[PDB]
């Protein structure tokens, strides 16, 4: 009997609120749009991870040289990490 | 890993870098330890202490913010009243008589009446 | 604690030189640490002097105990001796 | 968690194998991060893009500064070293993690998990029944 | 459950295993951080002895000679210690980590705790435990048909003694191999112009003393295991007759126990003779009859 | 995985050489790690295939449920269905 | 906060040079950290 | 545990002040353990056993090996560095330890 | 770590025309030879004695027969 | 001939002096305990007050 009374009271108290649904709907929409953003811009910029880079940093008074070529060791590793991350982001967007 | 790499300027005009067959490396006739010493001294003097102690000021401000947040919980006089209030309120929220009184806006146990 | 030091260790059979100017990078940092620590020490000492002065002024070897019994007309609340009044006063400091 | 009784001996053995595999993967990854390098020496006498290699001894001077050594070491490590040899620990980590996931997915799948917890809770209290003991005593 | 299954020698072996594991970790960390071989050309007012070699050549010579000259045992010694200590810990935990016998072990611990927890045991030796008697007899119907737990533990002890024997046997021979100095002659000539190289690594003597301490610890572990195994094959733990409850309390019940039950009672007596005495109250038919009589006088 | 490799990376405008022999110090260590890991994978596959065959051997979808019904003389313990004979078989594996 | 900082530390008894330019790699990182931190400070101020 | 009420407000404040002092002392000690060094450079013009401090500028060449630099740095750090400058964090740690021991003395 | 230099030999540099690896080898050898054994083993010594003290202090209650 | 030095020497010396003072206090505590053991004859406890 007490459980019946509490259930009826909770139903009357909660059927009238209508906030949790709005919050979860907003969270779902935000997750979708953020996934879209981070799958668009990241894939747009993903080609910018290159192992060798040419920099003409314009310093002669201290060096005597103009242009330089550099090897960045982590470019392959970072490209692989970005690929795995964007694949996981694709999965996240599918779920969203 | 915080440090600076310093290189002298050959052309000094009023204490300013004047900036005045293939390319060759300009040699400053200075060994490595001299670079270490000059880097240390320049980092010591000409680097703004704000850029050097930024994380420490941030940490101090976070610590005082947290202390102010929890001070009333930590201060015994206020904490005693707070624990008294929260202890009483929980049982007032869960009293077996509260539900029936709210329902009436019956048969009751004498124990629950005594406790109420 | 100073950033720059001047040392003459007189090693010439190994170096030839006599005097050296040296840099201790943390000396400014250690000065900051010293000032902060001694400020903490000043706070600790102020707190301790407050405690000792309060204890000497209080004379808490006998609990007055007369205000409560006078208010509630519980005449059988005798003043308690040392090792009971001191703790009573401490608990009153926490909560009367 | 009472799910330990749900694990047969081979389940625990797979768990231990995966734990050891994860540990060795972490060890390999951290050691490769901290110390995996190559030390390169140029060859002056080259036959068919191969090092021919053909009054006390004197050292060979290749007219190269330290930064050139670092650059060439990085270049050959990136280019002429097999990816599997460099990325072995991370492939191992991937395999261990997916093995663990395949181990736990049914436990982490709510549809199955509800039934599993229901069954184990019911069976524990059945084994705890004060009447089961009497009934099996009379058999 | 996790405490009363360890005799004194078991706790000693646990401490020895922890020490060996920590020492192996320390050696591995030292190898990872600081273990390096330094190499110089061997064959040659006193002045410098420049050999016109660069830092890349220095590192390459160090690499090649360390890979070639230094003993594989010397390099794997922290790893070998770690591996053997891990095997020791695994076999120490596996006695309880196998669910088939672990269920019986847990039931034995629970029933012994419940029986010794019952104060009617003290009443007899001077409530609901009567129903608990059923579990007791049910337990005596279940685990006395085991004894495979004893076989598993004997296998574990034999394997541990074998591991200690093998470790001593080959580590004793390998210990003298490590040296502070070493020499190597590789075809680095015409690659650097030099072939003979004197080399040394800092760790050598420290690791030698480390090995000495490790071998002493292994000796202690072997002594402990030998004592345990000797006790296993001297008191004949397959049968345990109390001969004290029957004589003291004057109860002619409790005839005997089976191999598994006798082994368990022996181990508990090693931990503490009194817990076994307090657990034997509910195996007593005379006591159980007295408790039934008391319950019957209450209920009638 | 080999201790030593040969690279004709063909950088002459920067270095001026054709071929370079590089020593990878950790190749032996990685080889030992790989051997241990492949042995562990062999063990894991042994266990998984054993369990797969054992599950495909007894057809755990129906629990015969005859031993106890014949021993304790309770004929009314019929076979349980799928997803339940699975549970009973697993409990039998742990402790019947 | 600047990546490059120029110093005239006046050491000529040991160096013979007057002015020096220095690269401080983490300066831009420190600026990013400062921006993200003052964002949180503003948020905390608003809430307060 | 339940001994919270025994501590006066000033007792809790001393507890936290000691906590802060110990934290900063430990940080200083662990920093001095690894990153504490001194960079030494000799003086060529030495008058009265002191540094006399006497077309682009050129670098001054002391013609000294880096190992010699390390040796002179270590020797100067040992001989001519103030002992308080070398052991401030350890002293602060000891003082925090004795403060804690006095606080929990009766406890 | 031990830093080593040779002893027997306007001031200038006093280079002995040696490389860094030679410095390291000499440091290793002199660390092994010249440095006092007890000086090198003081941390291990203190650790071992403290371990013995802790073990013998706990052994009173880790001894199950009397515990 | 080689002049050498290791940095941790004097710091180790100071730390060792402190440790030895600690062991001295440890021994003083032990001596107090043993004296209390070798002065009261703990083999028999007499209440004489209960």
From Swiss-Prot, chain D:
Compartments where located: Cell membrane; Lysosome membrane
Entire-sequence positions represented here: 15 to 176 of 810
Taxonomic lineage: Eukaryota, Metazoa, Chordata, Craniata, Vertebrata
Subunit structure: Heterohexamer; oligomerizes with other LRRC8 proteins (LRRC8B, LRRC8C, LRRC8D and/or LRRC8E) to form a heterohexamer. Can form homohexamers in vitro, but these have lower conductance than heterohexamers. In vivo, the subunit composition may depend primarily on expression levels, and heterooligomeric channels containing various proportions of the different LRRC8 proteins may coexist. Interact with GRB2. Interacts with NOX4; this interaction prevents the ubiquitin-mediated degradation of LRRC8A.
Family membership: Belongs to the LRRC8 family.
Originating organism: Mus musculus
Gene symbol of the encoding locus: Lrrc8a
Post-translational modifications reported in the UniProt record: N-glycosylated.
Comment text on domains: The volume-regulated anion channel (VRAC) channel forms a trimer of dimers, with symmetry mismatch between the pore-forming domain and the cytosolic LRR repeats, a topology similar to gap junction proteins.
Site residues, Required for anion selectivity: 66
Residue intervals annotated with topology Extracellular: 34-86
Job of this protein: Essential component of the volume-regulated anion channel (VRAC, also named VSOAC channel), an anion channel required to maintain a constant cell volume in response to extracellular or intracellular osmotic changes. The VRAC channel conducts iodide better than chloride and can also conduct organic osmolytes like taurine. Mediates efflux of amino acids, such as aspartate and glutamate, in response to osmotic stress.
Tissues in which the protein is found: Ubiquitously expressed. High levels detected in the bone marrow; lower levels found in peripheral blood cells. Highly expressed in pancreatic beta cells.
Protein name: Volume-regulated anion channel subunit LRRC8A
Segments crossing the lipid bilayer: 9-33, 87-105
Curated annotation (Swiss-Prot), chain E:
Domain of life from the UniProt record: Eukaryota
Segments crossing the lipid bilayer: 8-33, 75-94, 154-175, 206-230
Reported effect, residue 55 to R: No effect on channel activity of the complex with LRRC8A
Positions in the Extracellular compartment: 176-205
Induction of its expression: Induced during the earliest stages of adipogenesis.
Localization: Cell membrane; Endoplasmic reticulum membrane
Residues in coiled coil: none
Disulfide bonds listed in the record: 39-199, 65-184
Tissue expression remark: Expressed at very low levels in adipose tissue.
Description of the deletion phenotype: Mice do not show remarkable changes in body weight or the weight of white adipose tissue on a chow diet, but display significantly lower body weights and fat mass than wild-type mice when fed a high-fat diet. Moreover, improved insulin resistance induced by the high-fat diet is observed.
Summary of subunit composition and partner proteins: Heterohexamer; oligomerizes with other LRRC8 proteins (LRRC8A, LRRC8B, LRRC8D and/or LRRC8E) to form a heterohexamer. Homoheptamer; inactive, likely because it is not targeted to the plasma membrane in the absence of LRRC8A. In vivo, the subunit composition may depend primarily on expression levels, and heterooligomeric channels containing various proportions of the different LRRC8 proteins may coexist.
Domain notes: The volume-regulated anion channel (VRAC) channel forms a trimer of dimers, with symmetry mismatch between the pore-forming domain and the cytosolic LRR repeats, a topology similar to gap junction proteins.
Record's function text: Non-essential component of the volume-regulated anion channel (VRAC, also named VSOAC channel), an anion channel required to maintain a constant cell volume in response to extracellular or intracellular osmotic changes. The VRAC channel conducts iodide better than chloride and can also conduct organic osmolytes like taurine. Plays a redundant role in the efflux of amino acids, such as aspartate and glutamate, in response to osmotic stress.
Similarity comment text for this entry: Belongs to the LRRC8 family.
Organism this protein belongs to: Mus musculus (Mouse)
Gene designation per UniProt: Lrrc8c
Curated annotation (Swiss-Prot), chain H:
Residues the record marks as carrying a glycan: 52
Knockout mutant characteristics: Increased prenatal and postnatal mortality, growth retardation, and multiple tissue abnormalities. B-cell development is slightly impaired, without affecting B-cell function. Mice however show a cell-autonomous early block in thymocyte development and impairs peripheral T-cell expansion and function. Conditional deletion in germ cells leads to abnormal sperm and male infertility: the cytoplasm of late spermatids appears swollen, preventing reduction of the cytoplasm during further development into spermatozoa.
Positions bearing the site annotation: Required for anion selectivity: 66
Superkingdom, taxonomy of origin: Eukaryota
Effect of residue 33 to K/N: Impairs activity in hypotonic solution
Tissue: Ubiquitously expressed. High levels detected in the bone marrow; lower levels found in peripheral blood cells. Highly expressed in pancreatic beta cells.
Transmembrane segments: 9-33, 87-105
Localization annotation: Cell membrane; Lysosome membrane
Coiled coil: none
Extracellular compartment residues: 34-86
Disulphide-bonded residues: 43-51
Post-translational modification note: N-glycosylated.
Phenotype upon changing residue 26 to D: Abolishes activity in hypotonic solution
Function description: Essential component of the volume-regulated anion channel (VRAC, also named VSOAC channel), an anion channel required to maintain a constant cell volume in response to extracellular or intracellular osmotic changes. The VRAC channel conducts iodide better than chloride and can also conduct organic osmolytes like taurine. Mediates efflux of amino acids, such as aspartate and glutamate, in response to osmotic stress.
Annotated domain remarks: The volume-regulated anion channel (VRAC) channel forms a trimer of dimers, with symmetry mismatch between the pore-forming domain and the cytosolic LRR repeats, a topology similar to gap junction proteins. The di-leucine motif is required for lysosomal localization.
Family: Belongs to the LRRC8 family.
Protein name: Volume-regulated anion channel subunit LRRC8A
The gene coding this protein: Lrrc8a
Complete-protein stretch covered: 15 to 144 of 810
